[PDB]
Design a protein around this ligand. Structure first.
Ligand code: K
Ligand code: K
Ligand code: K
Ligand code: K
Ligand code: K
Ligand code: K
Ligand code: K
Ligand code: K
Ligand code: K
Ligand code: MG
Ligand code: MG
Ligand code: MG
Ligand code: MG
Ligand code: MG
Ligand code: MG
Ligand code: MG
Ligand code: MG
Ligand code: MG
Ligand code: MG
Ligand code: MG
Ligand code: MG
Ligand code: MG
Ligand code: MG
Ligand code: MG
Lengths: 52, 63, 141, 183
RNA sequence: GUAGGAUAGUGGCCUACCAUGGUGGUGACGGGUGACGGAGAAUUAGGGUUCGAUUCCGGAGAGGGAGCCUGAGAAACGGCUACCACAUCCAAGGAAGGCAGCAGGCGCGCAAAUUACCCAAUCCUGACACGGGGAGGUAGUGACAAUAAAUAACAAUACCGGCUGGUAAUUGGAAUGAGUACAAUCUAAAUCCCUUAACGAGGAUCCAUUGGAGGGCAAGUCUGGUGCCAGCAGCC
């Protein structure tokens, strides 16, 4: 006695999800410079890398 | 940069060069004139002339 | 015990040959039955959408998995193909042209979807991934 | 028949067997950052070369000491290692080949050498200088950082004669600024 | 087996007569192969497993069979003859066919490029030093596969951590190739590469993507939405 599931429900959550714009951020360096940043962050300057 | 390599030929005289050198190399030096032709057109003309016998064969390939 | 006679090479070879058939992987690739299956030994196959169908998820999950009934063009066989991603069934219509790939487990059902061994990769010549990300648009005709 | 088909080619590296070993990842990142490499593929290529050399040496060491094949190939390999600075004259045994590390090969890169002799303020500066045609080994301009410098050619490294840092004709930026300042 | 015929020649290859022989669980015979064979390819403790249409070697075929002329050499097919299947033209009486050659088209499919230039190189061929060669080469399309390798480097200032390092769309001048283009070079002629006048970088907009973040397996007990729905999830 409910409306559990059906074909008409396709796209429910994606349609419901409010749209949020992507923040404009400066591009990261590529290649050797990217590796340099990673090495400095993980070894030189310095819990997980994405811990809160 | 600043350096290059190549091959050079010096013939005893111009006639020997004209007698032994390739046509394109002679053209590059101005000793010969390039003749404009199309190989496909030559082939088509030859094939057309194949079907005609006698003196008229000469103009048969034109078509 | 094993046979060990120096002149018993024939028996060892024959015994291994006979016992290889007990191996399911060996038998699958040596019985010549792959050509009677819907894909007939191909990675992909094109087909026409006949009908959208909802398949209940297996226990302990509860969901309606969206799938399409597709007839393969090259042999006329009918299969069930899963349509992945949210709301991607809306990009499928009856009589549409779809490219079908395997579900990743080499002819066996995946996850909580029962009896489904295929998925839709493209619809009307446009990949479902591009449609989901709005990179491309489904052709009008 | 297409004659080009007879040219042969080969791979130069392999991917790690286990993609996500934390200790391996840390060590590789440390090496890449120390030597200023652009990606893990360069390190894996150097590892591939080192593994090939070590496998050859290990194969040779299995043969009898008086085996002519062992003598010939061991002399060839030792000469090859000596030419490129991997091994020192005292290191005159195939056994010392097995004691070679990826760092030994990395230290022979034109980028590392350019950084070490003092032509660059940093390894990345050496990389950009090399790829910008500011460095020459002998009389030949080299723009490949992976260039492996031999012992004889090490002392000939210098600035390109056609570059601002080696001769005249400053760069386009300097010329533009000079022209702008002329008014 | 004997004697002949035929063949370039041996041989039941065929004919006449004669004898009953020949193969087979050490698998004959029959069947399947999405089976041309090999040199080789992938993977590599060793042993092994899987692949081999395709550029080298050998065989076979030219829509399916069969027969044959010429010729040193063919049971030839960019040769002929007949039948079978397809199929173009016709003034309806006839007449002409063979892309599993190079391009290209239809069809088929998950699945594969230009109806280009040239004999300059390699070589072949003819009466021939010279002609011809879709063999072969050049160029076009080409993220099959493989190689090297950009997307930034350095100082000042301000923050931080111990003169030493890290960060900043703050400041400062230097360097350079992607691009563009005289020129030369390349090339059979072109084009590309290499070289190089004059241009070509600050949010260096000259803006790196593909997959992931519970475990296997590297990476959030962050925030909003949904609420066994939608969906995810190779496995759990
Ligand atoms: K259920
Ligand atoms: K559940
Ligand atoms: K004979
Ligand atoms: K006989
Ligand atoms: K065969
Ligand atoms: K003849
Ligand atoms: K063709
Ligand atoms: K030629
Ligand atoms: K995981
Ligand atoms: Mg006889
Ligand atoms: Mg073969
Ligand atoms: Mg076949
Ligand atoms: Mg082929
Ligand atoms: Mg062959
Ligand atoms: Mg034949
Ligand atoms: Mg045909
Ligand atoms: Mg025929
Ligand atoms: Mg024939
Ligand atoms: Mg033909
Ligand atoms: Mg022929
Ligand atoms: Mg393809
Ligand atoms: Mg590639
Ligand atoms: Mg970019
Ligand atoms: Mg983890």
């Amino acid at each position: 006695g409910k409306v559990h599931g059906s074909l008409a429900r396709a796209g429910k959550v994606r349609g419901q999800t409010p749209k949020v714009a992507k923040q404009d951020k400066k591009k990261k360096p590529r290649g050797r410079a990217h590796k340099r940043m990673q090495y400095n962050r993980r070894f030189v300057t310095a819990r997980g890398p994405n811990s809160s | 940069g600043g350096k290059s390599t190549g091959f050079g030929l010096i013939y005893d005289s111009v006639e020997n060069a004209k007698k032994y050198e390739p046509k394109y190399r002679l053209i590059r030096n101005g000793l010969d004139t390039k003749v404009e032709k199309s190989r496909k057109q030559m082939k088509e003309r030859k094939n057309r002339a194949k079907k005609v016998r006698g003196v008229k064969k000469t103009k048969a390939g034109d078509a | 015990g094993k046979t060990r006679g120096m002149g018993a090479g024939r028996k060892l070879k024959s015994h291994r040959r006979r016992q290889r058939w007990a191996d399911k992987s060996y038998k699958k690739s040596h019985l010549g039955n792959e050509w009677k299956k819907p894909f007939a030994g191909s990675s992909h196959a094109k087909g026409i959408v006949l009908e959208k169908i909802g398949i209940e998820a297996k226990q302990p999950n509860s969901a309606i998995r969206k799938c399409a009934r597709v007839q393969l063009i090259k042999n006329g066989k009918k299969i069930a193909a899963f349509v992945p991603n949210d709301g991607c069934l809306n990009y499928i219509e009856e009589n549409d042209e779809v490219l079908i790939a395997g579900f990743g487990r080499k002819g066996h059902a995946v996850g909580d979807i029962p009896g489904v061994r295929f998925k839709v990769v493209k619809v009307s010549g446009v990949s479902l991934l591009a449609l989901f990300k709005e990179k491309k648009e489904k052709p009008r005709s | 028949v297409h004659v080009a088909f007879y040219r042969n080619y080969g791979k130069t590296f392999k991917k790690p067997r286990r993609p996500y070993e934390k200790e391996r990842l840390d060590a590789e990142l440390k090496l890449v950052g120390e030597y200023g490499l652009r990606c893990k593929r360069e390190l894996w290529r150097v590892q591939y070369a080192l593994s090939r050399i070590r496998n050859a040496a290990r194969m040779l060491l299995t043969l009898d000491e008086k085996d002519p094949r062992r003598i010939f190939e061991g002399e060839a390999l030792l000469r090859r290692m000596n030419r490129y600075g991997l091994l020192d004259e005292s290191q005159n045994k195939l056994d010392y080949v097995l004691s070679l590390t990826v760092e030994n090969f990395l230290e022979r890169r034109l980028q590392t050498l350019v950084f070490k002799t003092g032509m660059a303020k940093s390894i990345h500066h050496a990389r950009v200088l090399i790829r910008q045609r500011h460095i020459r080994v002998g009389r030949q301009v080299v723009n490949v950082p992976s260039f492996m410098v031999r012992l004889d050619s090490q002392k000939h490294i210098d600035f390109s004669l056609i570059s601002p840092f080696g001769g005249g004709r400053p760069g386009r930026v300097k010329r533009k600024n000079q022209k702008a300042a002329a008014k």
